[PDB]
Every structure is written in structure tokens, then in C-alpha cells.
Design a protein around this ligand. Structure first.
Ligand code: ZN
Ligand code: ZN
Ligand code: ZN
Lengths: 210, 50, 707, 147, 170, 125
């Protein structure tokens, strides 16, 4: 019975990652953005032989921003709780494919040794980690949350020059902030927060990632 | 002020009704002054004077 | 009214009153008598104010608003009314009674604290003592509020004190970190602002077009020789037509952005100058007759407003980022200024001449330039006192809740203390779920989502439990179930020789079971999933007149051959069945899975300002609907449920908002919650102060409670 | 955990600054009434009602580990007194506390140990009535209960 | 013809569905074959479930339970006379049954009480006095707080919930 | 059985040992296929009279005509009623009252006690 929900969810999380890929600018197909639930059900031809490795097949590649510098890679592990062994094979898989970034969506949680190992992967390929439940809905669509746009290091240089500030003196944002995680930004990078204002109508802020 | 018929009295002939206060070029034309005209109000005579 | 209360008491004792939604029958009764006595006070209150002569000095003090009010007239002339304490009628102090002067259990008005008299006739002895009780709650409230607010204010000032606007006009604290890029997001002073109406929020797209557009086809109503003077000569100009047509093009785009900024549809904003009063000062002095013909060229107006727009410097610079900062920061004053000084608006309504308009431009320039906040100022300290002051004003625990539900969204100072501390465990956390369109106009869809959202434990659903000794179901002591046992002969027909002879039987309440829309296979599958296959369940049909569930426990069959000594230390299964019975109840979390206690109170909102939508005519409209209001916190999961709105679902709890929606969403939610608590008195604390408060607490990602 | 899944019956007693809580039936056994039928009678001498009697039933079951007054006195002593060696002074010390400090107003001698037991039982009964809801809670301010 | 079968469990489930159809001897007065119909029902259920799972077994029993109801022998009679086709009987999706004269009412009554649980939680703040100068409605609430006061005297606060508008008496 | 029945199986929470005067506990006899009750501190044992050993909730033992003693009829503070006819004795005048308990028996319904020494009868209306 709950299996039938799953399909809505598998549709639903795939769609959120697509918007996530689209906001980062990795150019997904408009049709994949437009993909309905009925089509997705049609796409995996629902109803047969349940618990089947649809998610291993759901694993997708996404192709490049303004400058085709390889790609970003998205992986949905079948295991409810993923351990280092699945990660190691997956690492063999990312290395063979020679991909540059890997997003893993775990269904319950990751072992701390794997997170450690993920922490060790940091020099080479980057690994990003989402809890399935927080990813299951597009948080960036929510009304409380203002439009965020990441700036290039050059734009940050011009910003600090024109206001005459130090990096240290800007407002900070958590590296684990759901929105910072959403873009996947690292330390030193700046996000431009654009807000509606009761009195300004529009107000622009910046937050240095801390 | 309490006066008149909120929401529909001023729309009924503007029979000046004298209630509503109007001041023009530094002269009080009509009406009666109260706490809403003179008090700590957002639009009191006193605020405008400052 | 007293006979009417006795009448309602007579209905109540008959047992047939029919309760009100979400309430016990006493509450229905108490809510009803309270409605009658209040209506009684107000009816005679409105009678006494009518009955007053013109010469009543008492009415003369009330009307100037000097001292005192309508309620006082009510109390001195009419009837004082129901007293109360802690928001309820005078409690039963003695056994079921307020005073020994009454009968036990006497819900009448007088016997439980209604004062029939006016101060002028004097109070009767019981009323006097129930009035002396109403006298204490206020004296005590006074002594407490003075101590608490003195403390809340000192802590607040102590945080913000070192914030201040610097000479490049960015607001920064002691270690020189930036708080805001411009003070209050526009760089204006708080004492020079005024309430103003935004013309462009005018309803109907057609109506806007008519009132604002400068026609060129010229309706046969005095060929431009009406109102305007020599402008009849520039009717043949192509350039002037295209430039104004360009003006109107900006106004449709501004009207579109302004609709995004203020989705609710309020036209009241704080802005400097008050352009409309100035036009009136301008008309009045130059002696402008609005019936006489005009003497003003439209292009002079349009370009003059452009030039004035450039003069209103708020951000000095020249590079692309300074121009964007200048443009966006005084966006809202700029769209307002174009809307007031519009060519068609200027020509028809305000009739100003050329000399009067040029003077008008010069004053707005001087007033706007004067309005910009003075760097050096102490802004951080200024704000703490403007926040501190309303905590001084009113309410500690008084109940004025009119949101047709639970007392929630605690009112007043204790709620302020929670936002101020960022309590990891508020006394009364909440959460407002709005519902998807279809499921919002229909009750039955709303009932199905509501049941999915609710969290109920099997203990609530169970009418009763029993544990029986029955080795042989085929001859069970419960002869009525006997029909079911024959029904379950083929129900694993072999391990009936192996399963324990101990029986648990559960009976479920019929109304409550139906209400959750549950089916037995859901329960069986839930309990099977929780305890395991070892827990062998069977159940009857959901349509039998006595809805019952039967539970046994199966073992591991093969290995249980008394190997060592049974690694259970020989626990009797009955005793174990109680532990199963205990935990089966306390654990089973069907539909709702976590902490929303009871989870709900469904509401119809038509009163508030919700679901405000745009229509194709262009105007705003009300959209009544069902919304779900919960008393618990689980926002992360509750957002992902179907037909729940992923957009407008909100919670008053700022720690949970932080977990899910990040630091910027905290900055907003906390503002709304601080705005909302101040707004209960509705003294209107100026927004710029709260923006500054929120920015200081959210300045560094992590939440910095001012503790 | 998997003991019985029910904490809301476990009636205990604090005696005056005894370093540890004691189960009430142990106190009764320390008074000397070892027969459960007698303890039950002392709590409620109107055993026509199965529900309250069932309510106390797990605390009687919990008491079962000991059924001698001497042992129960030594038990309260260890639950009271700092660690030591001999059992017998511990029984005597426990006995004088149980005699003198336990509701002194009902008596301070040996020869009225039985009467004291009756008063403890009406007290447990007074407690059980509120937990069933048969009797409203006392008011924290009722001047009738002030001096 | 009835679809071929060989499984012993399927055969006994048909026998029980047939036996349930034998209740009250209505099958005699109508003269309809309960063994062919029970087999057609069972086939249709199996076509849905495709195995002999607990869920199939539960469905067989609930089909049995519908046949054995003492208060509604007319449901059985409707299935016996072909007013209900086996493919329909096979699915409970078409509701559950409503010819026992009271339980349907009660479920309706339950549907009333949860709908009674929707009616207004508890309306209030109606006093109904002054007219609003915005949305032109008189549905308004008033607030009475701070008695005596320090220097902001117990002024009368009036709020229009209809559009969240608040003004003062005077 | 029938819908118009009742569930008072006689919850015998009391059946003490005939010898040591302590409580009996259930225990299985697999040999005889019968529940038995035994004292733990001794060998004494006897068969049960019911298959039940424990029940919980009834939820509605509305408990309307128990505990409340007839003698409450004497209390001067309770309202005497002119409303007539005890349903037992041909005499008017009854004291009445409500709930008087925490099982907040949302029970707003009134309980009436006859006051003349001929009944002591306690009904409800
Ligand atoms: Zn309104
Ligand atoms: Zn014994
Ligand atoms: Zn009688």
C-alpha cells in the first residue's frame, strides 16, 4: 500500500532535484522540468514487480552550465541506510565515469564513517548529501525565503572594493544552512540575497559563507 | 469623532453636518476639535504644525 | 435576559442542548451564557448612551476624549455586568459554590458573578465581594508587569547599544560588522515619515486605464481647450505622444511590481513628504482656481519628475552597482512620486500652474533631502526603547482571543519573552497548514487530509481491552466470536497447534473508528509491522454490530524445543501479553507519526484577509476557504504531505523554521512574530526598528538569542 | 522497558528526609502486617470494588520480594542508613524511626503501631480517590486549610 | 464456463464462498448456481490479487462476511439474482453496503459529527457595532484592556477582523 | 449473542489463598488445558471460574447510580425541588445535583435523590 505513494515521492524528489539542477544552471530539459506525474508513471510503467531497482535506473546525469566543463552526477542508492561499502563501489563508479560532483540521496541516514569518508573525499570529487525527507519538497519555493543568487569571486572583489569592506565584516550564513546546502556553496563564497521590502520595495543584501 | 453616520453619512448630501473638521490656509472653516484633531494622533493639527 | 439565562439552564439540565464544535457541553453552555450576559450589557449600554442629554458633562468629557469612555457611562448609568477572573466567571471556591450565600451548583448570572447594579444605585453585598475579586486581578497584574518589563527592556538595550549609522551610511556595530547597507533599507529618518496612500493599487484594470491615461483621440468635450490652455497646439506632436505612451508603459510595469511587493493589497505605507498635502499647500497659496483653464505644459511635468528623480540622491556612486543601489532603494518612493505627479492626474485633479509646480518640485527636493538619516546617530539604542515601550503597554495573561479556536499564539509579554529568548521548547508551539485549492473548497477532501495529518494512538481508538484464556478457539468461551473462529479455520491451519493459548481481545468504538476512516487491514498490517510475524493477528468484519479485534502471539516454531532453558527466563505469555498490550497502545502511530499531540481543529476563514488573489479584471478579491491549524511542531515532514501548501504553510516557532528554512526565513518569521505581538495593542511600532532588531539577532547565520 | 509497561500505578512513600523513596507496601510490612489480605483491608475496608483493588495490585506484586517485618526493616534501613555492617541495629534504628517519626501525631509508642497503620491506609485511600477522580483535588489556598 | 483451477486452497475458498451463498436457502427459491458464481467471483478476485496472499484471504473473508450478514440477506439475494455482477462483487471500491437500515445512517452520522467538528470551532467577537471604512461591513470586534492605566486611559479599541482594520472610538 | 447485552463478567480482582491469605496469580496447566490460580509463596492452587484475568476501560461506566449515598438527601445546601413523584414512592420532593466529580463527566445531566424514609431511591432523568 505505501509502495503506491512511493511513486509519487520518486516522481516528487526527482522533480525537486531537477529544479535544483536548473537553479544551479546545469541546463536540464524544459520537458523534464515540465514532466508530469502521469508521464513519470508512464515512464517507468508503474505497477509491475514492485521494489524493483527503478532508482538505480533513475540515476541520472546532468549537463553543464554556460561552459560545458564535464557534468554533475546524481545517485539514488537502493539501501535504506547507506554504509561505506556502497560508497566505495559508488566511488569506483564515479572514478570510472570520471565525473566531477556527486549528489547522493539516502532514504534514512548515512553512517558516520561514510560521512567521515565523504569528508576525506573533499580534495578530489565533491560529495553532497541530502536527507530524503528535506529534499522531498522544494523549500526554495516557500514564501518566507527570498531569492538567493551566488556571485563569482570577481563580482565579490568588485563589491568589496566599491563599498570598501573586508570579507570578515559581512553578514554570515551557515555552511549547513538548508539554502547554502541547496546551492552547495563552500566557504568564502558570497550569496546575494534579494528581498521584497515593505519600505524599500526591494532590498539587496550579501552574506559571506561561514 | 463619534458624530454622524460612519460609512454612509458623508455620502448623504454632505449637508455639511458640521461634524468633520476642515482647515484651510491657517483658518478653521468648520467642525469641532477633539483628541483626534488635537491629540497624539498621526494627523493631528499639532503634528502638521511641527 | 435573566429569564433567558434560566431558560438556557433549563435546556442544559434536560440533556439536549447539542454542543458547539470542538467544545465540551459545559463550554458550549458557558460560551452561550457568556454571550447572553455580554449582549445584555451592551444592549443597555447602548440604551444609556442614547438616553444622555446634550448637557451631560460626563458625555462632554468622553467625547473630547479627554478622560474616560463609553464603558464608564455603561457602568455608572446602566448595569455593571459579568465580572470575571482569569478570563472566566467567578470560580467555585467552596464545594461547588462561590459563597455560602448560594445553593450548590447554581449557574445563574448573579450567583456566579454578574453585577446587576450600577455604581450609582450601589452594589449588593455578594456583588461587592465578587467585585472586590475583579479588583485584585488588576492590582496584582500591575505589580508583576513592572518587574518583568523593566528586565526585558534592560537586556534589549544592552544588546543593540553599540550599533550606529556610520558616515558612509551603512549601519555597523562595535567590531565594525555591517548590519544594514542602508539604514532601515532606504536611509530615511523615522520622525519625518508619514502614512500615505498608493494610487496605483486602484482596483479594475479598466478603471486604472480610464483615470490615469492621457487620451489623444479627444472626446468632443472642448478640444483640449478645456482644462489645458495652449496644449491644444501640441496635440499634433508625434514625439510627445510617444513619450507619454512611454510614461504609461512604465506605470503598467510599476503597477505590476507593486502588486508583487504588497500581495495583501494594503495601500498604507510610511514614506516621506506626503506629496498630496504639498499639492494642496501649492494650490492654496498660488490661489489656483480649479475651474479656470490650466497653464502648464505636460512635457515640463514628465521631464521635471525625471530630473527630480535624479536629484533625490540616497546612494552616491557611479558604477553599475551604485546605480542599482540608488534605483532599488528608493523604488517605492519613486513609483509613488510618478503616480501622484502623473500628467493626466496633474492636469485633471490638481490643476497646478507652471510656477506652482516648479516651486512644488523644489520643496519635495528639500524635504526629501532633509529626510535622510543623520550618520553618527545611535539607531541601535533608539530601537531598543521603541521596542521596550510597548512591552510596558498592557496585557500579561488577559484573554481576548477571537480566532474561534485554542488560546494559542499566546498573547502579550510572555510571548515576547519567548521570541526574545528563542526558547528551544516554547510553552505553546503552533503551526498553520494551508490547503490546496480543491481540498480547500470541499469539506470531505479536507476531512481526508485532516485525518492523515492528525496523530492518534491506538489507545485513543480502543474502547476496551481484555485478556482471555482460550487454548481451543474451536470451542472458545466467547461464543459470539465462535462464528469468526470457523471463518478462520484456514487462517494458517497448522500453527494453531503451536501458538500460545493466551488471548487478547480488543473492542473498538464505532464512531471514533469511523471518524479516522480506518479499515481493519490497515490496523492488522500496522501491528504486524510493529511487533512482527510473531504477533499472529485476526479480525472480524468492519460492518459487524460489535467491532472487535482479536490478538494472539506465535513463537518461532522449530527452534523452541527447550534447548538450554528458553532465553526469556521463562516469562509467562499473559504477563508478556500485558507488555504487548501496553506497548501496542503506547507505540502504534498510524497516519500521523509524531508530535502533534491531538493535532487539530479545522477552521473556516472568511473573516480574515486570507487567500487574497488577483483576478483577470485586474482587481483583488477575497477567497474564503478551509485551513488547518495545528498545535504542535513537525514542519519538515508536514510540508511534504500531499495537498498541503508548500508555499504558505507557516509556524510561529522560530527554532523549527531555522532547521527547515534557513537563516533568512528566520529573519522574516521572527519579524512577523514580533510585528504580530506589538500589533495586538496596535499601537504600531515603526517597522524600521524591528528590521534593525531582526538583523542584529540573525546577523551571523546561527541564531543569537539575546540571552 | 519490558517489565510491565505501566508506571502510573507505582505508589511510593517518602519518609522524613530518608535518603531514598520506599514502596508503601514495604512500610506496611515494616509495621508488621505481612498478610496481603490484611494490607488490602487497611487500605480499603470496602473491597466490593474491583477497580481500585486492581489499581493497587501491581504495587502488591512489586512488594512481593519480601514478606518478613525484620527483613523489611533492614530493607528500609539500607534504603535509609549509610553503609555499615551488622543488620540488627539497622533493624532497631529503622524501628524507632518507623515508630517515632512516622506520623507522630497518631502516637509515639509501640502499643499504638497498629492504629498508625490504619491512618496510613486512609491516607493511601485518600490518594487513590483522587487518581480515580472520585474526589476533587484539594485547593492550595482554601483558608479552611490554613492556621 | 467456470475457469479451470487445480490449487487445493483456491478450491476450498470457492467451497466456502459457495457455503456462504448457501446461507438462508435463498439460492433455492431463486434457483441460481452458487458454485459457478462463487468460482467466477473467486477468479475475479484472483485476477485482482494474482496470488493467495493474506490480503487475498482477507478479501475472501470480507466477501464471506458480506454473504453471512444476518441483517442484510438482501445483499446476498442481489448477488444471487445477478443484480450485482461478480466483477462488481469482487471489488469493495464501490462502497460497502447499506441495506441493514441503520449502520449506514450511523456512518452518515459519523460523517456529520466530524463535519460538526468543522462548523466554526467557536465563533465570537461579534458585538456587531460600528461600520468599517474600508470593506463596508459592520462585523466588528472590540478590545478592552488596561483598566485605569498609567497615562494611556482605558480607551476603546475596535477592530474590523473582516480586513484587519483598527480604529479608536472618540 | 445480541446487541442489547452487557459486559460485567465479574472482574474478580480478589481471590486470596485459603492458607497464607495472599493473592492468587494465573498460571498455565498445559497438561489439563486449564487456567489455574496459584499463590507464589506456597503450593496451594485452585481452578478459575472465568477465562478472564484482566480488563481495561469501558470508557463509559457512566457511573451514574453508584457511590452516591442516599443520605446526601439530608444536606441543607442542596436544592429541594417542587418537581414531583419519586419513581418508586408516591411522594414528591427530591434533592438533586450534578457530577460532583473529576471524570469531568461532561455529564451536565441532573441526578435526583428521594428524601423520605421509604425509598432512599436514586434515579436520573
Ligand atoms: Zn474592514
Ligand atoms: Zn498461598
Ligand atoms: Zn421515594
Amino acid at each position: 500500500m505505501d509502495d503506491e505513494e512511493e511513486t509519487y515521492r520518486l516522481w516528487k524528489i526527482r522533480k525537486t532535484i531537477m529544479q535544483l539542477c536548473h537553479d544551479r544552471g546545469y541546463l536540464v530539459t524544459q520537458d523534464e522540468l515540465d514532466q508530469t506525474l502521469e508521464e513519470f508513471k508512464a515512464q517507468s510503467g508503474d505497477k509491475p514487480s514492485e521494489g524493483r531497482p527503478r532508482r538505480t535506473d533513475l540515476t541520472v546525469l546532468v549537463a553543464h552550465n554556460d561552459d560545458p566543463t564535464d557534468q554533475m552526477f546524481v545517485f539514488f542508492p537502493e539501501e535504506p541506510k547507506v554504509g561505506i561499502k556502497t560508497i566505495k563501489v559508488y566511488c569506483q563508479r564515479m572514478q570510472e565515469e570520471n565525473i566531477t560532483r556527486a549528489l547522493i540521496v539516502v532514504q534514512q541516514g548515512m553512517t558516520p564513517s561514510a560521512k567521515q569518508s565523504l569528508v576525506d573525499m573533499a580534495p578530489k570529487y565533491i560529495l553532497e548529501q541530502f536527507l530524503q525527507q528535506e529534499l522531498l519538497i522544494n523549500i526554495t519555493e516557500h514564501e518566507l525565503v527570498p531569492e538567493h543568487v551566488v556571485m563569482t569571486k570577481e563580482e565579490v572583489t568588485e563589491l568589496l572594493a566599491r563599498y570598501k569592506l573586508r570579507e570578515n565584516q559581512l553578514p554570515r550564513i551557515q555552511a549547513g544552512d538548508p539554502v547554502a546546502r541547496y546551492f552547495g556553496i563552500k566557504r568564502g563564497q558570497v550569496v546575494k540575497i534579494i528581498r521584497p521590502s515593505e519600505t524599500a520595495g526591494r532590498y539587496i543584501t550579501y552574506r559571506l559563507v561561514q | 469623532t463619534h458624530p454622524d453616520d460612519e460609512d454612509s453619512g458623508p455620502y448623504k448630501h454632505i449637508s455639511p453636518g458640521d461634524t468633520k473638521v476642515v482647515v484651510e490656509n491657517g483658518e478653521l472653516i468648520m467642525g469641532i476639535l477633539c483628541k483626534k484633531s488635537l491629540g497624539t494622533s498621526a494627523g493631528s493639527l499639532v503634528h502638521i504644525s511641527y | 435576559a435573566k429569564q433567558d439565562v434560566i431558560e438556557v439552564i433549563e435546556k442544559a439540565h434536560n440533556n439536549e442542548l447539542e454542543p458547539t464544535p470542538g467544545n465540551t457541553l459545559r463550554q458550549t453552555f458557558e460560551n452561550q451564557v457568556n454571550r447572553i450576559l455580554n449582549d445584555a450589557r451592551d444592549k443597555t449600554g447602548s440604551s444609556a448612551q442614547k438616553s444622555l442629554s446634550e448637557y451631560n458633562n460626563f458625555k462632554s468629557m468622553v467625547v473630547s476624549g479627554a478622560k474616560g469612555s463609553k464603558i464608564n457611562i455603561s457602568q455608572v448609568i446602566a448595569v455593571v455586568g459579568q465580572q470575571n477572573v482569569e478570563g472566566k466567571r467567578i470560580p467555585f471556591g467552596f464545594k461547588h459554590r462561590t459563597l455560602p450565600h448560594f445553593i450548590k451548583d447554581d449557574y445563574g448570572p448573579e450567583s456566579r458573578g454578574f453585577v446587576e447594579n450600577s455604581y450609582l444605585a450601589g452594589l449588593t453585598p455578594t456583588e461587592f465581594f465578587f467585585h472586590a475579586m475583579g479588583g485584585r486581578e488588576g492590582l496584582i497584574d500591575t505589580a508583576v508587569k513592572t518587574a518583568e518589563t523593566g528586565y526585558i527592556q534592560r537586556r534589549l538595550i544592552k544588546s543593540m547599544e553599540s550599533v550606529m549609522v556610520k558616515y558612509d551610511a551603512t549601519v555597523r556595530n562595535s567590531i565594525n560588522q555591517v548590519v544594514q547597507l542602508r539604514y532601515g533599507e532606504d536611509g530615511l529618518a523615522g520622525e519625518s515619515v508619514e502614512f500615505q496612500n498608493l494610487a496605483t493599487l486602484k482596483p479594475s484594470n479598466k478603471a486604472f486605464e480610464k483615470k490615469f491615461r492621457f487620451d489623444y483621440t479627444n472626446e468632443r468635450a472642448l478640444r483640449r481647450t478645456l482644462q489645458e490652455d495652449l496644449v491644444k497646439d501640441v496635440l499634433s506632436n508625434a514625439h510627445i505622444q510617444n513619450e507619454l505612451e512611454r510614461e504609461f508603459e512604465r506605470m503598467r510595469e510599476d503597477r505590476e511590481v507593486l502588486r508583487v511587493i504588497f500581495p495583501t493589497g494594503d495601500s498604507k505605507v510610511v514614506l516621506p513628504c506626503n506629496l498630496l498635502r504639498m499639492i494642496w499647500n501649492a494650490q492654496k497659496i498660488f490661489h489656483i482656481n480649479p475651474r479656470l483653464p490650466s497653464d502648464l505644459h505636460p512635457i515640463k511635468v514628465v521631464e521635471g519628475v525625471k530630473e527630480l528623480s535624479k536629484k533625490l540622491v540616497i546612494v552616491n556612486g557611479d558604477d553599475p552597482l551604485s546605480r542599482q543601489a540608488q534605483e532599488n532603494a528608493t523604488l517605492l518612493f519613486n513609483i509613488h512620486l510618478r503616480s501622484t505627479l502623473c500628467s493626466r492626474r496633474m492636469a485633471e485633479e490638481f490643476r497646478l500652474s507652471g510656477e506652482a509646480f516648479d516651486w512644488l518640485l523644489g520643496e519635495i527636493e528639500s524635504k526629501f533631502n532633509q529626510a535622510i538619516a543623520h550618520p553618527g546617530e545611535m539607531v541601535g539604542a533608539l530601537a531598543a526603547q521603541s521596542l521596550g515601550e510597548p512591552a510596558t503597554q498592557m496585557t500579561l495573561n488577559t484573554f481576548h482571543y477571537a480566532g474561534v479556536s485554542a488560546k494559542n499564539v499566546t498573547l502579550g509579554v510572555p510571548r515576547l519573552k519567548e521570541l526574545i529568548n528563542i526558547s528551544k521548547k516554547p510553552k505553546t508551539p503552533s503551526l498553520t497548514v494551508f490547503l490546496l485549492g480543491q481540498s480547500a473548497r470541499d469539506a470531505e477532501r479536507a476531512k481526508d487530509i485532516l485525518c492523515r495529518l492528525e496523530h492518534t494512538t491506538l489507545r485513543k481508538v480502543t474502547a476496551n481491552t481484555a485478556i482471555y484464556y482460550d487454548p481451543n478457539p474451536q470451542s472458545t468461551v466467547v461464543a459470539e466470536d465462535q462464528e469468526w473462529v470457523n471463518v478462520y479455520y484456514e487462517m494458517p491451519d497448522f500453527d494453531v497447534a503451536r501458538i500460545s493459548p493466551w488471548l487478547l481481545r480488543v473492542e473498538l468504538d464505532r464512531k471514533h473508528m469511523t471518524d479516522r476512516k480506518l479499515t481493519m487491514e490497515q490496523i492488522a498490517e500496522k501491528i504486524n509491522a510493529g511487533f512482527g510475524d510473531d504477533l499472529n493477528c485476526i479480525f472480524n468484519d468492519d460492518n459487524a454490530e460489535k467491532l472487535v479485534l482479536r490478538i494472539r502471539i506465535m513463537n518461532s516454531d522449530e527452534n523452541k524445543m527447550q534447548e538450554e532453558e528458553e532465553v526469556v527466563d521463562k516469562m509467562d505469555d499473559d504477563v508478556f501479553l500485558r507488555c504487548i498490550e501496553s506497548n501496542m497502545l503506547t507505540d502504534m502511530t498510524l497516519q500521523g507519526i509524531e508530535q502533534i499531540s491531538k493535532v487539530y481543529m479545522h477552521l473556516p476563514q472568511t473573516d480574515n484577509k486570507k487567500k487574497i488573489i488577483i483576478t483577470e479584471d485586474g482587481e483583488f478579491k477575497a477567497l474564503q476557504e478551509w485551513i488547518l491549524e495545528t498545535d504542535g511542531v513537525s514542519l519538515m515532514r508536514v510540508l511534504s504531505e500531499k495537498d498541503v501548501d508548500p508555499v504558505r504553510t507557516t509556524s510561529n516557532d522560530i527554532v523549527e523554521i531555522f532547521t527547515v528554512l534557513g537563516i533568512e526565513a528566520v529573519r522574516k518569521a521572527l519579524e512577523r512574530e514580533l510585528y504580530h505581538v506589538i500589533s495586538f495593542d496596535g499601537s504600531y511600532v515603526n517597522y524600521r526598528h524591528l528590521a534593525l532588531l531582526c538583523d542584529t539577532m540573525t546577523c551571523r547565520g546561527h541564531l543569537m538569542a539575546i540571552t | 522497558g519490558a517489565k510491565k509497561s505501566a508506571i502510573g500505578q507505582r505508589i511510593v512513600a517518602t519518609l522524613p528526609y530518608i535518603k531514598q523513596e520506599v514502596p508503601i507496601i514495604i512500610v506496611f510490612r515494616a509495621l508488621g502486617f505481612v498478610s496481603d489480605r490484611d494490607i488490602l483491608e487497611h487500605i480499603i475496608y470496602d473491597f466490593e470494588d474491583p477497580e481500585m483493588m486492581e489499581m493497587v495490585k501491581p504495587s502488591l506484586d512489586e512488594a512481593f520480594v519480601i514478606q518478613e517485618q525484620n527483613v523489611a526493616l533492614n530493607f528500609i534501613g539500607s534504603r535509609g542508613a549509610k553503609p555499615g555492617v551488622t543488620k540488627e541495629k539497622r533493624i532497631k534504628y529503622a524501628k524507632e524511626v518507623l515508630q517515632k517519626e512516622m506520623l507522630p501525631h497518631v502516637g509515639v509508642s509501640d502499643f499504638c503501631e497498629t492504629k498508625k497503620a490504619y491512618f496510613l491506609g486512609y491516607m493511601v485511600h485518600r490518594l487513590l480517590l483522587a487518581a480515580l477522580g472520585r474526589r476533587e483535588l484539594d485547593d492550595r489556598d482554601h483558608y479552611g486549610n490554613k492556621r | 464456463r467456470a475457469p479451470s483451477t487445480s490449487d487445493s486452497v483456491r478450491l476450498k475458498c470457492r467451497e466456502m464462498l459457495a457455503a456462504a451463498l448457501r446461507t438462508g436457502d435463498d439460492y433455492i427459491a431463486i434457483g441460481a448456481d452458487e458454485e459457478e458464481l462463487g468460482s467466477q467471483i473467486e477468479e475475479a478476485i484472483y485476477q485482482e490479487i494474482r496470488n493467495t496472499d493474506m490480503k487475498y484471504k482477507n478479501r475472501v473473508r470480507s466477501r464471506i462476511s458480506n454473504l453471512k450478514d444476518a441483517k442484510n440477506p438482501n445483499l446476498r439475494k442481489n448477488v444471487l439474482c445477478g443484480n450485482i455482477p461478480p466483477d462488481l462483487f469482487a471489488r469493495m471500491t464501490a462502497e460497502e453496503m447499506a441495506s441493514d437500515e441503520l449502520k449506514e445512517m450511523r456512518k452518515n452520522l459519523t460523517k456529520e459529527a466530524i463535519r460538526e467538528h468543522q462548523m466554526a470551532k467557536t465563533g465570537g467577537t461579534q458585538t456587531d457595532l460600528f461600520t468599517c471604512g474600508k470593506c463596508k461591513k459592520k462585523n466588528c470586534t472590540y478590545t478592552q484592556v488596561q483598566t485605569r492605566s498609567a497615562d494611556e486611559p482605558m480607551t476603546t479599541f475596535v477592530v474590523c477582523n473582516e480586513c484587519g482594520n483598527r480604529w479608536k472610538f472618540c | 449473542m445480541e446487541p442489547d447485552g452487557t459486559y460485567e463478567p465479574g472482574f474478580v480482582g480478589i481471590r486470596f489463598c485459603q492458607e497464607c491469605n495472599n493473592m492468587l496469580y494465573p498460571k498455565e496447566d498445559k497438561e489439563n488445558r486449564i487456567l489455574l490460580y496459584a499463590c507464589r509463596n506456597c503450593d496451594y492452587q485452585q481452578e478459575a471460574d472465568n477465562s478472564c484475568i484482566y480488563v481495561n476501560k469501558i470508557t463509559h461506566e457512566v457511573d451514574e447510580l453508584t457511590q452516591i449515598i442516599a443520605d446526601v438527601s439530608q444536606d441543607p445546601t442542596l436544592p429541594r425541588t417542587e418537581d414531583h413523584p419519586c419513581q418508586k414512592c408516591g411522594h414528591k420532593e427530591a434533592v438533586f445535583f450534578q457530577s460532583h466529580s473529576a471524570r469531568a463527566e461532561d455529564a451536565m445531566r441532573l441526578y435526583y435523590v428521594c428524601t423520605a424514609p421509604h425509598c432512599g431511591h436514586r434515579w436520573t432523568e
